[PDB]
Amino acid sequence: NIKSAKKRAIQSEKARKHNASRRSMMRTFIKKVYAAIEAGDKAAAQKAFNEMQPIVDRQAAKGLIHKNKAARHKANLTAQINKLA
Amino acid sequence: MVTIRLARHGAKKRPFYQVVVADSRNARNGRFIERVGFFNPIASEKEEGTRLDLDRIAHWVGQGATISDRVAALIKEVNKAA
Amino acid sequence: ARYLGPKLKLSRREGTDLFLKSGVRAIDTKCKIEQAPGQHGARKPRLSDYGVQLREKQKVRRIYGVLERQFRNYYKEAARLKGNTGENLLALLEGRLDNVVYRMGFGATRAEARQLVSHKAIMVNGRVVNIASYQVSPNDVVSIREKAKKQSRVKAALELAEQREKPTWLEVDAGKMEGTFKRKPERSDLSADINEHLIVELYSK
């Protein structure tokens, strides 16, 4: 409707696309981690955890994951590897 | 933002402003944290016209509160005594 | 909002002189007082208990020239004030500005005093008060303005002020034509024959 709501519509669409991509990459890295924990692999899962840590902290800082969630992930996953190793 | 601001309470064509401390996104005559003085722009030429608790104002500005232009003008009017 | 009719008729239903035509002459002499308030006025009423209470309230209102919502508000204010509600009610009726102008001899009647008050001929404390029911505080000076001073009425009215009893709670002085309401009138200082317990009991039913 005829306003500056049109601009918020198009910006929220653009940011929807950007956030969906970054959120999807973050979730795939976390799937790498506890999909490596599905098999009994310690150092493979540690390599995947070191691969996911900067991106989850980074998406926490960029403002789309709200860092407590960031913390939870790494906390949960650390538990999984010292349940395993 | 919390704001020390005026809030219109008198009758029609006869305002009495009460200076309060409100969360700034409330209504004018709505919800406030504490009232801290008043300002009658008439009152008569008698004694006061305005009293205003400077200790609580200094407390809230210490907390981070902002002050509108009228309340700043009233503090610049009642400076310490006059 | 005020009466505007035959006055001595009101004074004749009550059976008592309500001072409604004080004016030039002496005691009525052309009223046929007591005799006939209407066509069947020669009949004795055999009045009820509601009739005596009602008729007492009407006596007081028709004296002071007050209508019912205003009188009723005086009863509420006299009730809430501390003390004796009959005496408080007469103290509220006696502090009326038109009454104080009548007591000082500035008007011949209370309606003439009410027209002096109404036609901006009266100041209290050096400010002109246009209102019949202004409530005169103690230690006030109420006077006539320079306009409507030395008009005939007030002079004649002061002429008939000496025929009456000179109320104790005033400073009547007619030289300068200014007066001082000094204190509230005591119940024992006024009129002695109105029964205010009847109007307390009238409003308390």
Added chain:
Amino acid sequence: KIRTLQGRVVSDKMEKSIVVAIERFVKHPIYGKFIKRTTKLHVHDENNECGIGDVVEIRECRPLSKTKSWTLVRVVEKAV
């Protein structure tokens, strides 16, 4: 100190939890008679030491399940 309550165990049979009836003794607002009045509470206990018919003190904590915001401190008076 902490605010706590006392009550008795009304039933027992649940997997590391208990339920406690509290007896508050309150005056009727209209009638002016002091009337007993209960408050059943789902109360947590680690390792379920208290059985049925006990008396136990009880404090409030974070939520531990649906209702269940209460946890014991001291089991007293277990006498059967």
Added chain:
RNA sequence: AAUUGAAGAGUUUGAUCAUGGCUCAGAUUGAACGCUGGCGGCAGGCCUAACACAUGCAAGUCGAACGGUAACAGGAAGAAGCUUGCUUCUUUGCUGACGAGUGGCGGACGGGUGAGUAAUGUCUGGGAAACUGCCUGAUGGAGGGGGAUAACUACUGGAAACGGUAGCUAAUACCGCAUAACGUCGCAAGACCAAAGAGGGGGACCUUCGGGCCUCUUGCCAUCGGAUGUGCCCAGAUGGGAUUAGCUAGUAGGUGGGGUAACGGCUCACCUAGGCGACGAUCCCUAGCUGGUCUGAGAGGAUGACCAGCCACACUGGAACUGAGACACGGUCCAGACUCCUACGGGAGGCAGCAGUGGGGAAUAUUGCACAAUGGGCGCAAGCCUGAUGCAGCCAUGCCGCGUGUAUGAAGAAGGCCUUCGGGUUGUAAAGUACUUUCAGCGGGGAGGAAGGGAGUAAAGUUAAUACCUUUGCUCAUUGACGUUACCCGCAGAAGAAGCACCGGCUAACUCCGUGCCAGCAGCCGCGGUAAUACGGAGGGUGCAAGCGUUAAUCGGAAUUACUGGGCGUAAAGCGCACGCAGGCGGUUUGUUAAGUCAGAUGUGAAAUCCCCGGGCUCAACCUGGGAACUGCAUCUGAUACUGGCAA
């Protein structure tokens, strides 16, 4: 000083006393209707169709973030009529600025409505497992690069709405890289995580002579605090129905995984078989809740329009996206009903914002003026926006104030009505006479709501700088929608200004005439069938008064649900009689506890409202200062007589 507070009557009977119902007298209202209507002040105004909506406004702003120039006005340069001295035209964002666009912030506030919701809500009191844009304090960082994409241009699809394709460009847009804590994870060892510039001014130096460089202001990032706001939990309280007694399988709990900002059946797998319920679950009807309002002596009863706090909703049903915050009134998506446009392929809309329409209804307002004030958004500010708000319009809808004159005046005029025809009454009423001008009308004068903001100085601070900026004084023009304002003065003349109900008893106030169980009246008792104080008219009176009556609704009276504060032999009312569980109550003495109870303290019980003492509007209504109050709850400290617990 803050509770000075309580009325009855009519009607059962031939009469009585009691019981008992019905009814009246009071106060109130978002009121409507009937008759009447002068002025002002302050308030209030769709209670019904959460029905459908024409039209106009209700949310924008910033160039001191960025590419840029669509206009407007200048500047520079060129050419021309050339009056060689002024105009016309053109290239240049060069400048003040600015359409469109990117970007930041706001559109989650403000404003509306009460549909749903009987307890995921509200009120009161506790709590822990939290997030928090803007605002504030502290500690520090703010280095070095890259790829894009709008706008723009060129085609192109479409009736339109709206797109598509190919190139170009910027940033405080976006992304890496470095850096790394008193940050995240981890027991540690360690691992890992961010950023953005812009503006004002300037001595010297270096200029690829655009600017580097210095300084100030402002912005960015990280962490820890604070304040505010929000999310979550518990206990108690907050309608009616038992002619609704069983309800519940993610249901109740546990373990582990996931999820959220955060605890949690929030979710899933497995294990246990619980959980709720007669202290009323479940079902059904109704309903937004509160501060409060009305009534009441009070306790209560009814209610929750305005004003303020909370919740919920935004055509209907659902969903998420962006964001600090929404599952979003003037956002997105889908579906549905309706309405509209169409080239028939498809599109568009959402007044329960403010005015306004149509409809519904007994009923409820202007398609107004202004941002001057107060507040909000944006902005360094100027300022722009603001149907919030200030005001104005209409309406007796309420409350309050004032007016319609005042004094005199007996020939007790005339006329009306009654009359025992003597007179009485209307009635000092009118007329006459003498005064006054409130308000309305006319003409002048004229506060206050106006504080700020702008432009020059002077001083101080900062600094390399006597710049720039900030602060404080001083000076100069100014800033009012209301508004021919409030108010004051002058003018002319009583001149423009009184109705409505009632008169048998209750209930204040009476006769005549007309009608004759009719016409009709009525709240109850009941009037009217020929001399009606009850009907209809007249005279007279009574009550209220710019109002007055009727109707609807609430409380009172009603001690006719009785807690305060009732009853049960015969008026209604003792189960047909017992036994007895849960429940209620419990002799007497001592000791302990202190739960009830009592006393004090602290925190809270929002503000307004009620009450008290004051203050301002000429008074009043109204506004307002301080107190009291909010009868409560929680915690701590005590007392231990009574009740309870425990022991004897």
